[PDB]
């Protein structure tokens, strides 16, 4: 995630101008390889046309260039590109909106589950670590960065997310499907045992705890849904062929023809096709942001910091349910008292 | 469902290029028959024009070709195509979002419904199988793959979704409407009997169970709504006529005329209309993805794996409510304990 | 409602082609009268130009035709047409999504309200018929088909939706506003009396019943809102004038001029303006689907089957709350038992 | 609000044609003044060009007219107009969706709050009038029609919405912010007193009452948000300048030049610019509907009937909580009994 | 926030015309610096071309100007500009919709938490100030105006939002993440202590209080999400390069060439490029509103008045929970009594 919100707080003179001098998360970083390939191909074709070709073959190439430049507009690159990018951005913000945050649940665990002894501490930590374990189990499946941090469940044991007893229980409960749902059933059964044991005073608190847990379950299920059900491959293939064919055509039709021939539209012979390179910038950059936000759980600069979210959720939850349980600041009159 | 999310985790050099070499769920698989028909018709017309036609008829065909090529832009294929595809994609993701998952409900069943004896086991399995039976009853109606797996309710009896007593009860309760709603009333009555029998300790747990069941009912009702209320047939007919008329016009207007006549725009005579074939690719592929995602419960490569979802839901629910009821891993201090 | 979902389950060779041979809910049925009027006007103008007009008046008509054909693009028919149709489709699916279904409420009535005697039967049937009566009272106001089935509340008495006592009470409570909200207050008071009488064991069940009833109230209020607050008449007038002016211009500018005059763009003289008729097809069909989905509760082929929904809701609710109350299939071990 | 839903129930021959003969809520009523001003300016410029100008100044004006007509397409009126109108319509339906309806709350008040004596009557009427008073307090701030009906809170006292005791209490609680939130705190405290006094039997009913009241609070807060946070003035200025500059350019560039000069595109000299007037119709009407739906609480023909909503809510709520409390129709078997 | 809702209540003759004479929140205020820079560059280039350049260099500049003006349409400024502005506006209204309002929670605190003594007063004020402290802690992080008002937590102590005991507790609980979530855990623990101490009579009221608090937590988490996860920097860079390249091209291609050369399209030599300046107005103003609404928590004229919201929330909450607790107006019959 590249954050520049503080730099664009106010609309000032050239507020977006200072953002053009960035490299992390920039469009130049996503575009330089493709632009170098396109530049090399364009200038190789130019050197073939200007030097290698015989005059009749030069005339044939000029006719081909005019033919390709006159029909470049037949390719609806803007249409499919806009549809694809709109869908990608909608799915991207929906994928972020379904990232689970245990803050409501950890507040309810710190409040409802009573006991300042070691047993209540253990119970609260186990419940909120069940929540965090389910979250990290779904993030291990939907994110390549989290999977590279935790290649196996034993790495989750070494990271304090899973106890060896939980690892053995999860290996015992193995099925040919993903096992991210198991900590939710564990949470339900442990909360029922806590209520039956007197640690939870009323079943309405149990209902609130399980409602927050089920909201987290729905968010994790939506994450699994977005990881499994991708944008249809046909859309990706169509938009890729659109952009690639558009600029493969521009490799020939946007060549600067011989000004001695006095072709209409080719009177001035420049070396650098500034407008064609700007079109490459815009369209291929649109394609590259589609390629970057299609899976926002990878390891791109603008992809989500899911490892940081995992660590923050674990640390904050364990602080909230253990050190902050019935640990309140002294209740004193405020400044506006009477 | 064709999944390629892991292949596009990072925006790399030609990340979408490697996706062009796929066949399952590809646009070539959806386009090859139509493209072969279009190619055959185009080259038959070309061979008729170049060989069979008399010179005056060739002049008439050239005038007709210019007339058709000058007015190809009168057809708003992009407009109706974009509207139709946007509506199809919105409805497609809404249809996936309303696929029922019993995970919240099965967690509540494993927690609230008490009893490690055979009667509590039977009660929990019957409740969660009522949920799964309602889900499979609506998926039998909205999905052709599930209907091919279960042509009748007796096939659901052979698959363990329905007991013969439930089959007899459902045959007794027959009405001229769909009977997918019956297991929800069964769930409500059985949960009421469980609460009155002491298996459910508090009615707030009963309320939570029935709230999850009613959420599943709303999702299944939305599935039935999307199956019943299709996109209006007028839209499909209009977009089909748009694409078909566009490329039936291109069958004539995009023909390469005789370069000896020196027509404006037909100076260079190629054999393969690369731009016309690219337009066919893009537009007819847009139409084909509309045809593929219009009913995402069929048996296309990119259609939902509803049989897998049915099997996974049944297996996971029966594991969660029976083997995982009050079966917790040993509660031990974690790595960050004190 | 025209359903063709099963016919488009798989993307096959010409899947949308077989849908062009339909008549119910087709675009030809919505377009034939307007197309015949347009055809008659176009050919009357053609016969006036080719035969009735003097040569100088023919020259004036040719200049007028060129003037109208050169400025046909000044009319933004696609812009307003797309905005209007998108709004119509969004409102159409929102109107369907707010059609009340009493299934959750009838499950809660069959579960919570106890008593297998005649008094409990009467209570459950009265509650669920209050729900159905409110639904049919709002559908009588928002739908012309339901209003033609029930021109008065006495027709609702003859249809079993309302008892004569309820009809007298509703006549007594008459106000100059719509009285669809009355059965909700009746439901609340009757549920309170049921809870105070011991028929409902806990007030949490009362809360669940009234929550489902209030959800139905919100859906019916949204239906009343969509019936009352129409799309602003200015939008309809603007889009109608756009389409009508576009094709009134095409009545003159799309005429085939005399090829002897050798006008640019009018070299070939056909009889049938295929492209103009295709444009009429697409644009006027877009307008006609806007006209058909603007009020989806009428009696069009693609309009909702609201009478069927009313009958199904009444029948299913009365079956669920009366014959299915505490009437469960025998609870027996399933196939996967141990 | 102009309602024509019943007139467009069925898609008939010229269904939208009959809507062109309306005046209330019509586009002619919103467009006639601007169209008369544009017509007067256009014909004044025409009379200056044809009569007042010297021949050299006529040549200069012809060159200026060609220059303006060739660059009329540089103004993206359709782009900003579509964005602005889409945003306006979305905000308009969101503003209607957040209009508070007390029907759910009044049903809960008629049910939960017990007592057929004068004290229970007073309590129920006071609670539902607190709800209606909060609604009318926010509508007095967001609507100019409601503010013209009630210029002060004393007018609300004269209208029965506020008692003099409530007016004195609200004057005592005065702060430099809007005081529409006060009746919600009044409702909460009065409901707590009702529950503590035995009028509300269980606190779950208290929770339901306060949940409905808080939903009304959220709707009124959204109304206050839409009144306060307008569409940014920059958007309005940009779209207004776009339309005004487009048609100020059309005042010169769309003039009919002298046909004796034989200018290309100005061969035929008409008097009425039909296409320019149609463009004015469409674009300026789009602007006028943006001007009409930007604040849907004013006194336009298509603006909301907020005074009617206020009166209906007050009357219906006072009928529901007072005359309909425990006043049920006789519970008798229906037509389908056994 | 610039409010003009009352000025556009009715669609009158030139309703949007009076809004063009504004300066605060106007497009001229956002555009004058860029327009002056563009004007200076354009006229410097004009003076170089008309005076400094030799005749051959003037011919070269004329050819370059024609080349740039013929390919200005290759830049899709409207496409990326519309996508970016639509995304910005959607995110802007979503950011406003997640601004926390404690009105529902403060009503529940004033109702549920009993006690007119000093201890109940202290408890209610502490709970609602926990809510306001969490809100101001997230607004200090997402808003530069709130951060300039409160550069440190000691400034929050001086502003009455935080007691020194709370400041010490928050310093003790310091972690390398944002600490806005702490007052929610404080609220949960204090509400649990209030319920255990008898101040809250039933745990259902505790559930309602914590549900409102958790809704506020979700809103603040969404605010933190929008502050952290910005629009990807690639989009901003692409749209900025699009606008800047478009008008850097217009700096050369929109120059008025020598009319003596009689170039096609440059016959009339004006001094002021009115159409180019209008295009700058529209497109650069679209870019500037994107720059202004990208972070709506800064200090722009149209940015949110977050300091006012903070002050109003604090004042209104402290009035509602302290002075309005069990302080009701006298319950008397209204005007429509019997
Ligand atoms: Ca990525
Ligand atoms: Ca399919
Ligand atoms: Ca209709
Ligand atoms: Ca208005
Ligand atoms: Ca800002």
Question: Residue A165 has which token pair?
Answer: 């007893």
**What is the rounded CA–CA span in Å between residue B202 and residue A207?**
11
Tell whether residue C320 is among the known ligand binding residues: no
Question: Residue D90 has which token pair?
Answer: 């979305």
Classified as helix, coil or strand, C199 is: coil
**What is the rounded CA–CA span in Å between residue E209 and residue E194?**
11
**What is the rounded CA–CA span in Å between residue A65 and residue A181?**
59
Q: How was this structure determined?
A: cryo-EM
- For residue C87, list chain D residues with Cβ-Cβ distance below 8 A: 89
Question: Tokens 């900025």 map to which residue?
Answer: E240
Q: CB under 8 Å to D238, separation ≥6 — which residues?
A: D80, E27, E281, E282, E285, E286, E289
Substitution target from E92, E234, E287, E289 for chain A, most A beta carbons within 10 A = E234
Question: Residue E258 has which token pair?
Answer: 């020598």
- For residue E127, list chain A residues with Cβ-Cβ distance below 8 A: none
**What is the rounded CA–CA span in Å between residue D107 and residue C181?**
9
Q: Which residues does chain E break after (C to N > 2.5 Å)? A: none
Give the residue from D67, D81, D47 showing the smallest Cα distance to D244.
D81
Tell whether residue B73 is among the known ligand binding residues: no
**What is the rounded CA–CA span in Å between residue E231 and residue E242?**
17
Question: Tokens 């576009």 map to which residue?
Answer: C246
The angle subtended at Cα D59 by Cα E255 and Cα E268, nearest 5°, is 5
Q: CB under 8 Å to A43, separation ≥6 — which residues?
A: none
**What is the gyration radius of the CA atoms in chain C, in angstroms?**
29
Q: Check CB contact of D234 with chain C, cutoff 8 Å.
A: no
Question: Residue D200 has which token pair?
Answer: 């509300």
Do C236 and D26 meet the contact criterion of CB atoms below 8 Å apart?
Answer: no
Q: Check CB contact of A3 with chain E, cutoff 8 Å.
A: yes
Question: Residue D29 has which token pair?
Answer: 């009523």
**What is the rounded CA–CA span in Å between residue D188 and residue E113?**
11
Q: How far is the CA of D96 from the centre of ligand 5 (A)?
A: 28
Tell whether residue D10 is among the known ligand binding residues: no
Question: Tokens 């009937």 map to which residue?
Answer: D305
- Residue D97 — φ and ψ, nearest 5°? -65, -20
Chain E: residue nearest D222 by CA?
E97
Question: Residue B109 has which token pair?
Answer: 């069943």
**Dihedral sign from CA coordinates of D212, D213, D217, D220:** positive
Do B302 and B1 meet the contact criterion of CB atoms below 8 Å apart?
Answer: yes
Q: CB under 8 Å to C68, separation ≥6 — which residues?
A: C249, C252, C253
Q: Provide the Cα torsion A285, A33, A42, E242; round to 10°.
A: 30
- For residue A236, list chain B residues with Cβ-Cβ distance below 8 A: 4, 8, 16, 19
**What is the gyration radius of the CA atoms in chain E, in angstroms?**
29
Q: CB under 8 Å to A202, separation ≥6 — which residues?
A: E203
Do D108 and D209 meet the contact criterion of CB atoms below 8 Å apart?
Answer: yes
Residue A137 to residues A134, A179, D132: CA-CA distances in angstroms?
A: 5, 8, 50
- DSSP letter for C162, please: S
Do C213 and C133 meet the contact criterion of CB atoms below 8 Å apart?
Answer: no
Residue B304 to residues A229, E256, E275: CA-CA distances in angstroms?
A: 8, 60, 53
Which secondary structure element, helix H or strand E, spans residue B283, and what is its range?
helix B274-293
Give the residue from D215, E212, B212, B102 showing the smallest Cα distance to A104.
E212
**What is the rounded CA–CA span in Å between residue E154 and residue E167?**
8
Give the residue from A283, A127, A280, A137 showing the smallest Cα distance to A205.
A127
Residue C215 to residues B218, C220, C221, C308, E151: CA-CA distances in angstroms?
A: 12, 9, 10, 22, 46
Residue A83 to residues A80, A243, A293, B83, E23: CA-CA distances in angstroms?
A: 5, 13, 14, 10, 37
**What is the rounded CA–CA span in Å between residue C245 and residue D280?**
13
Report the 10 Å Cβ neighbour count for B237.
23
Report the 10 Å Cβ neighbour count for E37.
12
Chain A: residue nearest E221 by CA?
A101
B307-313, Cβ contacts within 8 angstroms, sequence gap of 24 or more = B307/B145, B307/B146, B307/B149, B309/B99, B309/B139, B310/B132, B310/B135, B310/B136, B310/B139, B310/B146, B312/A177, B313/B100, B313/B101, B313/B102, B313/B132, B313/B135
**What is the rounded CA–CA span in Å between residue D285 and residue D303?**
16
3-state SS, one letter per residue, for chain A? CCCCCHHHCCCCCCCCCHHHHCCCCCHHHHHHHHHHHHHHHHHHHHHHHHHHCCHHHHHHHHHHHHHHHHCHHHCCHHHHHHHHHHHHHHHHHHHHHCCCCCHHHHHHHHHHCCCCCHHHHHHHHHHHHHHHHHHHHHHHHHCHHHHHHCCCHHHHHHCCCCCHHHHHHHHHCCCCCCCCCHHHHHHHHHHHHHHHCCCCCCHHHHHHHHHHHHHHHHHHHHHHHHHHCCCCHHHHHHHHHHHHHHHHHHHHHCCCCCHHHCCCCCCCCCCCCHHHHHHHHHHHHHHHHHHHHCCCCCCCCCCCCHHHHHHHHHHHHHHHHHHCCCCCCCCCCCCCCC
Q: Check CB contact of C132 with chain D, cutoff 8 Å.
A: no
DSSP calls for B149-179: H-SSHHHHHHTTSS-HHHHHHHHHT--SS--
Do E258 and E269 meet the contact criterion of CB atoms below 8 Å apart?
Answer: yes
Give the residue from D281, D273, D237, D247 showing the smallest Cα distance to D68.
D247
**What is the rounded CA–CA span in Å between residue D47 and residue C284?**
39
Question: Residue D56 has which token pair?
Answer: 């050299």
**What is the rounded CA–CA span in Å between residue E215 and residue E102?**
10
**What is the rounded CA–CA span in Å between residue E297 and residue E310?**
13
DSSP calls for C184-196: HHHHHHHHHHHHH
**What is the rounded CA–CA span in Å between residue A278 and residue E242?**
8
Contact yes or no for D327 and C189 at CB 8 A? yes
Substitution target from E4, E96, E107 for chain D, most D beta carbons within 10 A = E107
Give the residue from D337, B203, B183 showing the smallest Cα distance to C324.
B183
Region for A104 from its dihedrals, namely left if φ exceeds 0, alpha if ψ lies in -120 to 50, beta otherwise: alpha
Q: Which ligand is nearest to the CA of E95?
A: 5
A123-126, Cβ contacts within 8 angstroms, sequence gap of 24 or more = A123/A190, A123/A194, A123/A199, A123/B331, A124/A321, A124/A322, A124/A325, A125/A318, A125/A321, A125/A322, A125/B333, A125/B334, A125/B337, A126/A190, A126/B331, A126/B334
Q: How far is the CA of E241 from the centre of ligand 1 (A)?
A: 23
Give the residue from C135, C164, C221, C176 showing the smallest Cα distance to D319.
C176
**What is the rounded CA–CA span in Å between residue D84 and residue E85?**
11
- For residue B101, list chain A residues with Cβ-Cβ distance below 8 A: 221
Report the 10 Å Cβ neighbour count for A45.
16
**What is the rounded CA–CA span in Å between residue D225 and residue D229?**
6
- For residue E221, list chain A residues with Cβ-Cβ distance below 8 A: 101, 103
Q: CB under 8 Å to A87, separation ≥6 — which residues?
A: A231, A235, B89
Q: Check CB contact of E2 with chain A, cutoff 8 Å.
A: no
Q: CB under 8 Å to D260, separation ≥6 — which residues?
A: none
Cα A117 → chain centroid = 42
Do E168 and A329 meet the contact criterion of CB atoms below 8 Å apart?
Answer: yes
SS3 content of chain C, % helix, strand, coil (to 5): 70, 0, 30
- For residue A206, list chain B residues with Cβ-Cβ distance below 8 A: 204-205
Where do the domains of chain B lie?
34-87+233-284, 101-230+309-323
**What is the rounded CA–CA span in Å between residue D143 and residue D137?**
10
- DSSP letter for E7, please: G
Do C123 and C194 meet the contact criterion of CB atoms below 8 Å apart?
Answer: yes
Contact yes or no for B34 and C13 at CB 8 A? yes
Chain D: residue nearest C160 by CA?
D335
**Dihedral sign from CA coordinates of A195, A199, A202, A204:** negative
**What is the rounded CA–CA span in Å between residue D225 and residue E219?**
15
Please count the residue pairs, one from chain B and one from chain C, whose beta carbons lie less than 8 angstroms apart.
225
Helix segments in C254-337, DSSP class H: 274-293, 306-318
**What is the rounded CA–CA span in Å between residue A96 and residue A84?**
18
**What is the rounded CA–CA span in Å between residue A326 and residue A99?**
29
Residue B192 to residues B189, B207, C110, C202, D205: CA-CA distances in angstroms?
A: 5, 10, 9, 12, 21
**What is the rounded CA–CA span in Å between residue E252 and residue E271?**
14
Q: CB under 8 Å to A295, separation ≥6 — which residues?
A: A144, A303, B5, B6, B8, B9, B10
Residues 248-307 on E with a CB inside 8 Å of A are 287-288, 290-292, 294-295, 297-300, 303
Longest dimension (CA), chain E: 97
Against chain E, the chains showing at least 3 CB pairs within 8 Å are A, D
Using CB atoms, pick whichever of A34, A83, A169 lies closest to residue B85. A83
Q: Check CB contact of C111 with chain B, cutoff 8 Å.
A: yes
**What is the rounded CA–CA span in Å between residue C320 and residue C337?**
29
């Amino acid at each position: 995630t590249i954050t520049y919100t503080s730099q664009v707080a106010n609309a000032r003179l050239g507020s977006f101008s200072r953002l053009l001098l960035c490299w992390r998360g920039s469009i130049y970083k996503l575009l330089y390889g493709e632009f170098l390939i396109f530049l090399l191909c364009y200038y190789i074709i130019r050197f073939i046309y200007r030097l290698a070709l015989t005059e009749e073959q030069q005339l044939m190439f000029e006719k081909l260039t005019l033919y390709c430049d006159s029909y470049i507009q037949l390719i609806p690159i803007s249409f499919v590109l806009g549809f694809y990018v709109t869908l990608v951005v909608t799915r991207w913000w929906n994928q972020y909106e379904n990232l689970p945050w245990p803050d409501r649940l950890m507040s309810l665990v710190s409040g409802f589950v009573e006991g300042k002894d070691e047993q209540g501490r253990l119970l609260r930590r186990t419940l909120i670590r069940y929540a965090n374990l389910g979250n990290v189990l779904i993030l291990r499946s939907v994110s390549t960065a989290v999977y590279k941090r935790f290649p196996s469940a034993q790495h989750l044991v070494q990271a304090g997310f899973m106890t060896p007893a939980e690892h053995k229980q999860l290996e015992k409960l193995s099925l040919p499907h993903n096992m991210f749902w198991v900590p939710w059933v564990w949470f339900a059964n442990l909360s029922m045992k806590a209520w039956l044991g007197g640690r939870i005073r009323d079943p309405i608190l149990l209902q609130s705890l399980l409602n927050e847990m089920n909201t987290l379950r729905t968010q994790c299920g939506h994450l699994y849904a977005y990881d499994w059900i991708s944008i249809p491959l046909v859309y990706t293939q169509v938009v890729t062929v659109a952009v690639y064919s558009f600029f493969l055509t521009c490799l020939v039709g946007r060549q600067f023809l011989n000004p001695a021939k006095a072709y209409p539209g080719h009177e001035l012979d420049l070396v650098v096709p500034v407008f064609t390179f700007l079109q490459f910038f815009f369209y291929v950059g649109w394609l590259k942001v589609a390629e970057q936000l299609i899976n926002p759980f990878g390891e791109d600069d603008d992809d989500f910091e899911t490892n940081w979210i995992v660590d923050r959720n674990l640390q904050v939850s364990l602080l909230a349910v253990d050190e902050m349980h019935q640990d309140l600041p002294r209740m004193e009159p405020d400044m506006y008292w009477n």
